[PDB]
Amino acid sequence: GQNMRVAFMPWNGYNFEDSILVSERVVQEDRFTTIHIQELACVSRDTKLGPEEITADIPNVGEAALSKLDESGIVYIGAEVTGGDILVGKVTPKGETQLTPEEKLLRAIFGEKASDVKDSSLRVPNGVSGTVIDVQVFTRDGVEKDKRA
């Protein structure tokens, strides 16, 4: 631990029973600043209705969430990601839920080639920020490796 200056005295009830009073000088010098290293895992299996694929092609996501990702869908090293953001973009297929002429025309105007996708991408847990330091990729043999790999 650290070596600190201490004094035994009640101080306006802030040490009422066992609470400890700490000066801002402590955090100014970063005496008790600590480091944690959390690990996030993203799994891409081969479930029904097709396999699971990872890329940047995601719907209902802003351009800010894509500025931190490459074309392959893996966040760059050192990017200062925050809580609730996107780290790895994973998608899974479905059917197409039929056709409706009005929504079909709107989609054709928009330019959506195939809206058969469900978002299951890995997101940063809520309330935790930080900086990505490393990304390791495991791929089964006999499977093509993307430019990131």
Partner: protein
């Protein structure tokens, strides 16, 4: 929605009514896709679809297809929720016997057939024949044969008799068993036989047969034929990661049973030999029994996990069972956790709250207001900007939490204070900030404990939270009247530092106009915080009819007390501050305010007390230091001197004069005396100090050592800690319990050698083990209190009965442990209070006794007062308000609709954690001597001897108040008399304790009549003493020819005739017992009633066993019927006795172990309910003899003595409540006009209310007797079967209720809790009163 709950057995037709189809295929899933199998455990045709409103094959869809069975798929199409409703049924090839009724402790089928349980299992498991049809042969209806016996008997009688194997045979026997004929024969046989052994099982049999007869049941239904199937979803096959599936073990049990059934049914067509089919039948029976309950019959079936697979019965009972895990307490939404952290600036009614936690918690609340103001349009947009934390979001969030109460919860809770309400105030940070004064209520400390928060939703919830659960409304603990907002730690230390005068200080010796300028002096530094000065103050007295009286005076006081006086309210006088202001006083001081100036001034005053205490403690600067602990100089020297004594003592052990034990005791005493002396010396030198006064003289004022401020003020710790810090630790205990011979001569301020430190671990580790284990018994005990007291709740205003209990202050031969004033406070008198002068009424009957009346009670010095007691309240299914007395929570008469039982259970359970799991009589003080139940006589020498049993001593003061109480044996010595104003410290009683006297009664000449020499009595002139005397021998040498002969010494006067005892002409001879030496001889004078012979011979678990009344290992026997004592026929194993009443006959006889001690003899008169031997007393016979009012007094006395020994104050009325639930059950003595069996056991309330309406007509009552059923058995013997099931032992309770066909009416509280209905208590009491009125 529903009125009551009905439970009974089931029938195959009823099962088919439940079911939708049959399951015939053990397969579950196709596993190619994820669709259910055909006729499998998840068959769509039998249970329902997979996804809402389209069949499996998908032919039918759209809204138009509701309620259609798609023929191709064969599946009814509807919403998927039906998967939680439909149930399947399996048609077993052969009948099977349900294990529960088979294998409970009382065997239902075994009792019904009057058959041993062991052989029924043999029959069912296909190993031994049993006759099912005797016919006209040499066999009985229920006879038993083996395979070779059947082989022999088959040829002798042919087909005339029939004997089979298995559940089919049992079912055939059950179906053919008549009921009415058995009932008639049982009724006729019950009156004929006279044998108590037969009576028990006879009554059980007739009760079971009556229950089956009176209910719509059939015995063969106890034998299963069709097996209902649990719905599919309740055993989910949730897909886990990858292709593997998570399979609940219950599905494995269904698969095994279906496989066995399919194999048996396919083997039945092959006409296989009986050997093969019997094995498969046994396999199927074992499988179904394990499915109903695993591990009951034999080894529990386990999978690859090597753990017992869960069964249906298992999933009900146990901590992991459905009830105690998902019915009483279930996980809830709108909650949060945090780390608790103290905050001083908060007011009493508000606690801090992190911004993030509140923002996420009140998400539903902000949504509505957000769209109300138009800042949002849809729900998804609202979610979008709320997670954007815009500026308006904080504004609206602050708007919606202006006065919205929240609930704070700490796990675990121990009493009513564990759940609190507060008005949150948003604060930055990530911790909950809580007001300090309430942390004592939580019994929590700010060392990283985690706090939990919930949020009420409805208007009713918020309103009741505001009205009840804020800390303002709860200042007095439900356990006792003492407050729970008692200041502690910093505030008490600082306030004590405020009020403590010094002989010399700056600013001493002037006069101040008032407190206002006095505060000015301290801030400017002109005067010290403490200085004895004169000052003018103002006092507002409410002595008139509730109006303040202002007066001005001058007081000699300190500056600090004047400073504190500013925040004191108007009513309190100034004398409440002139003292040293200790911790004990200030709390009581706060209490005094609650007795005068209401509630809100008290809470504001408490807040100001906190603020002033913190501020001036901070300005004080109280600090600990190494130099503070002053070790006495002489201490070391004393220790050296002590060694000398032990150095001598061991020599006496090495010299042979003193044994090891005596030397051990001497060493222990020497060390104890040395420790006490050094403790006294250290306390004396630490407590005092020397300082030069204003006149140049050294005056010894109270020491200002920091350790002494923490000690004396009581802020933290006790005198033991200070003793241990400076003085030597004293004697210490070994792990077994023995005391080490050499204690520790050093203290903590100095060093500790390795060996001395090692032995110190024994105490510490033992204490930690006690803390770790004692919580298990305590909390569990709490449950055993809650379940038996949950039913009780106040229902009516007044029962209108004057019966009650007599209560007197407790005296234990020394100081009175509890004065009468404290015990009676806040209760209601059962009778009118009479002055010691007769015909003068001090207090009327049916009048609540509050504090002002108690002053009148003590001013007149009332001896004792009889008060209303809820143990005998006349109300039904509750207790009337007046019997309960004063509510501690509100300070006034109890209300209607709140459950007393729950608060009583909490009050009796919370202090459990503070417990520990593992000659002559001298008058003490001044006063006269009074005795009651005393029948004394004067001996020859003029002394007073006693001829009674219950002779008690009293120390009557100048007024008549009781001071002392003692018990004396017969033939005691009295140095004084009754009513004499004697002096204290005088030996007034003396007698030989270690042996018993065989004293005579009256003077005369001893004549040894019927004196036998040779076998019974002989002149054993022992050479040790060489004294020739007649010695009566024991039963060893003598035999039945001489032991039965009793040598009786006929006590005669000088005339030689029988003594004319007053009242009785019976000669007062005393039969000589064994080993009773006749010390005196014939012809020598005898004193009046002189000795004939010197005849020779605790904690929480204790309280828990006392509540449920364990039978002691040595049950003291007491008298049963009042009458003249008579002996009985002996030598038939042990001794016997019979008591003859004056008028009625004497049919009572009982067997008494003759090896046991005795206290009663033939020539004596004993009242019923009086001791015969001595030892622990079973409360059952106490209640049977002395009545209800006696047993309630004993239990309360013992438990309160234990708690006072452990130093925790608990009100008595809480104990009584359990006692009222203790006597819930009674047993009929004689049926009379009632409609119950002679031996029937029916609850007292119901039997009394049923009797009352019958006797109101031209009929007579029914004689009964209240019994004693402990909590563990009283809880299960309750009408509400679900309530009993929730507590313990679900299997027996469910089976017993089912076979009896009981019917719960949801009268209890937990019943309404289970189904989510409003509780029949609290605010919900009014709603139910509306409900029952309309019904």
């Amino acid at each position: 929605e529903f009125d009551a709950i009905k439970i009974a057995l089931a029938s195959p037709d009823m099962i088919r009514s439940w079911s939708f189809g049959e399951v015939k295929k053990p397969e579950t899933i196709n596993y190619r896709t994820f669709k259910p199998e055909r006729d499998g455990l998840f068959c769509a045709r039998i249970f329902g679809p997979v996804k809402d409103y389209e069949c499996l094959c998908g032919k039918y869809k759209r809204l138009k297809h509701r309620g259609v069975i798609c023929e191709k798929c064969g599946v009814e199409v509807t919403q998927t929720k039906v998967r939680r409703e439909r149930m399947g049924h399996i048609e077993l090839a052969s009948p099977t016997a349900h294990i529960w009724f088979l294998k409970s402790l009382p065997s239902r089928i075994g009792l019904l057939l009057d058959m041993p349980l062991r052989d029924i299992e043999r029959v069912l498991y296909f190993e031994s024949y049993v006759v099912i049809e005797g016919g006209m042969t040499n066999l009985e209806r229920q006879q038993i044969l083996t395979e070779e016996q059947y082989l022999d008997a088959l040829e002798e009688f042919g087909d005339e008799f029939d004997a089979k194997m298995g559940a089919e045979a049992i079912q055939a026997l059950l179906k053919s068993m008549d009921l009415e004929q058995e009932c008639e024969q049982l009724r006729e046989e019950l009156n004929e036989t006279n044998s108590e052994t037969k009576r028990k099982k006879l009554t059980k049999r007739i009760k079971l047969l009556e229950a089956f007869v009176q209910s719509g049941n059939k015995p063969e239904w106890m034998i299963l034929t069709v097996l209902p199937v649990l719905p599919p979803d309740l055993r989910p096959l949730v897909p886990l990661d990858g292709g593997r599936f998570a399979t609940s073990d219950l599905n494995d049990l269904y698969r095994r049973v279906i496989n066995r059934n399919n194999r048996l049914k396919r083997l039945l067509d092959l006409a296989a030999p009986d050997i093969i089919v019997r094995n498969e039948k046994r396999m199927l029976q074992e499988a179904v029994d394990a499915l109903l309950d695993n591990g009951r019959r034999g080894r529990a079936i386990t999978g690859s996990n090597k753990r017992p697979l869960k069964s249906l019965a298992d999933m009900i009972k146990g901590k992991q069972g459905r009830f105690r895990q998902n019915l009483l307490g279930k996980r809830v939404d709108y909650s949060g956790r945090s780390v608790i952290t103290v905050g001083p600036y908060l007011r009493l009614h508000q606690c801090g709250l992190p911004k993030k936690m509140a923002l996420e918690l009140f998400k539903p609340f902000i949504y509505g207001k957000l769209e109300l103001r138009g800042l949002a349009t849809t729900i998804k947009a609202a979610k979008k900007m709320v997670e954007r934390e815009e500026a308006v979001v904080w504004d609206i969030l602050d708007e919606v939490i202006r006065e919205h109460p929240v609930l704070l919860n700490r796990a675990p809770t121990l009493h009513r204070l564990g759940i609190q309400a507060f008005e949150p105030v948003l604060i930055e940070g990530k911790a909950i900030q809580l007001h300090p004064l309430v942390c004592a209520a939580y019994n929590a400390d700010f060392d990283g404990d985690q706090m939990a928060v919930h949020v009420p939703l409805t208007l009713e919830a918020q309103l009741e939270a505001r009205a009840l659960m804020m800390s303002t409304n709860n200042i007095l603990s439900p356990a006792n009247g003492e407050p729970i907002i008692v200041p502690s730690q910093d505030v008490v230390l600082g306030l004590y530092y405020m009020t403590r005068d010094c002989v010399n200080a700056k600013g001493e010796g002037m006069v101040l106009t008032g407190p206002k300028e006095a505060e000015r002096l301290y801030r400017s530094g002109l005067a010290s915080l403490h200085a004895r000065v004169k000052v003018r103050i103002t006092e507002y007295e409410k002595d008139a009819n509730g109006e303040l009286v202002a007066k001005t005076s001058l007081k000699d006081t300190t500056v600090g007390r004047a400073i504190l006086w500013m925040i004191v309210p108007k009513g309190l006088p100034y004398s409440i501050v002139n003292q040293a202001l200790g911790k004990k006083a200030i709390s009581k001081m706060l209490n005094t305010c609650y007795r005068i100036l209401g509630l809100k001034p008290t809470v504001i005053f408490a807040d100001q007390i906190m603020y002033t205490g913190f501020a001036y403690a901070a300005r004080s600067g109280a600090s600990v230091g190494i130099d503070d602990m002053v070790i006495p100089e002489k201490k070391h020297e004393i220790i050296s001197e002590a060694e000398a004594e032990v150095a001598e003592i061991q020599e006496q052990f090495q010299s042979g004069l003193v044994t090891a034990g005596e030397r051990y005791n001497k060493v222990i005493d020497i060390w104890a005396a040395a420790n006490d002396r050094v403790s006294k010396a250290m306390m004396d030198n630490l407590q005092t100090e020397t300082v030069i006064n204003r006149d140049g003289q050294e005056e010894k004022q109270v020491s200002f050592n920091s350790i002494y401020m923490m000690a004396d003020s009581g802020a933290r710790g006790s005198a033991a800690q200070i003793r241990q810090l400076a003085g030597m630790r004293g004697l210490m205990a070994k792990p077994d319990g023995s005391i080490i011979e050499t204690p520790i001569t050093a203290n903590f301020r100095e060093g500790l050698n390795v060996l001395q430190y090692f032995i110190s671990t024994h105490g510490a580790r033992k204490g930690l083990a006690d803390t770790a284990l004692k919580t298990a018994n305590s909390g569990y005990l709490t449950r055993r209190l809650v379940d038996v007291a949950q039913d009780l709740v106040v229902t009516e205003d007044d029962c209108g009965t004057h019966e009650g209990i007599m209560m007197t202050p407790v005296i234990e031969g020394g100081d009175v442990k509890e004065p009468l004033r404290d015990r009676v406070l806040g209760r209601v008198t059962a009778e009118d209070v009479l002055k010691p002068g007769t015909a003068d009424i001090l207090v009327p009957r049916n009048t609540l006794l509050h504090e002002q009346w108690c002053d009148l009670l003590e001013e007149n010095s009332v001896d004792a007062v009889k008060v209303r007691s809820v143990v005998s309240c006349d109300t039904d299914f509750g207790v009337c308000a007046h019997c309960y007395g004063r509510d501690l929570a509100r300070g006034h008469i109890i209300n209607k609709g709140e459950a007393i039982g729950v608060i009583a259970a909490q009050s009796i359970g919370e202090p459990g954690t503070q417990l520990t799991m593992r000659s002559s009589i001298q008058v003490k003080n001044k006063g006269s001597i009074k005795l009651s139940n005393v029948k004394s006589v004067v001996n020859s020498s003029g002394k007073l001897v006693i001829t009674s049993r219950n002779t008690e001593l009293k120390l009557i003061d100048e007024f008549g108040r009781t001071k002392e109480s003692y018990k004396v044996p017969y033939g005691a010595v009295l140095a004084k008399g009754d009513g004499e104003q004697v002096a204290g410290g005088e030996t007034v009683a003396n007698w030989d304790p270690h042996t018993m006297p065989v004293i005579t009664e009256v003077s005369g000449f001893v004549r040894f009549t019927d004196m036998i020499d040779g076998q019974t009595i002989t002149r054993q002139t022992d050479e040790l003493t060489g004294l020739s005397s007649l010695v009566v021998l024991d039963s060893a040498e003598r035999t039945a020819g001489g032991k039965d002969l009793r040598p009786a010494l006929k006590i005669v006067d000088a005339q030689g005739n029988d003594v004319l005892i007053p009242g009785t002409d019976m000669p007062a001879q005393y039969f000589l017992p064994g080993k009773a030496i006749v010390q005196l001889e014939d012809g020598v004078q005898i004193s009046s009633g002189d000795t004939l012979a010197r005849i020779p011979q605790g904690g929480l678990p204790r309280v828990a066993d006392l509540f449920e009344a364990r039978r002691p290992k040595e049950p003291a026997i007491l008298a049963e019927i009042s009458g003249i004592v008579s002996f009985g026929k002996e030598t038939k194993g042990k001794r016997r006795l019979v008591i003859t009443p004056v008028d009625g006959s004497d049919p009572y006889e009982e067997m008494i172990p003759k090896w046991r001690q005795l206290n009663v003899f033939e020539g004596e008169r004993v009242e019923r309910g009086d001791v015969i031997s001595d030892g622990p007393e079973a409360p059952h016979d106490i209640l049977r003899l002395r009545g209800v009012h006696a047993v309630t007094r004993y239990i309360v006395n013992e438990v309160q003595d234990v708690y006072r020994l452990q130093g925790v104050k608990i009100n008595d009325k809480h104990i009584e409540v359990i006692v009222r639930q203790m006597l819930r059950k009674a047993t009929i003595v004689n049926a009379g006009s009632s409609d119950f069996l002679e031996g029937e056991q029916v609850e007292y309330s119901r039997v009394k209310i049923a009797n009352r309406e019958l006797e109101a007509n031209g009929k007579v009552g029914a004689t009964y007797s209240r019994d004693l059923l402990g909590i563990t058995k009283a809880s299960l013997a309750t009408e509400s079967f679900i309530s009993a099931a929730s507590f313990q032992e679900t299997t027996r309770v469910l089976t017993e209720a089912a076979v009896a066909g009981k019917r719960d009416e949801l009268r209890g509280l937990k019943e309404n809790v289970i189904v989510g209905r409003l509780i029949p208590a609290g605010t919900g009491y009014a709603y139910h009163q509306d409900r029952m009125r309309r019904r």
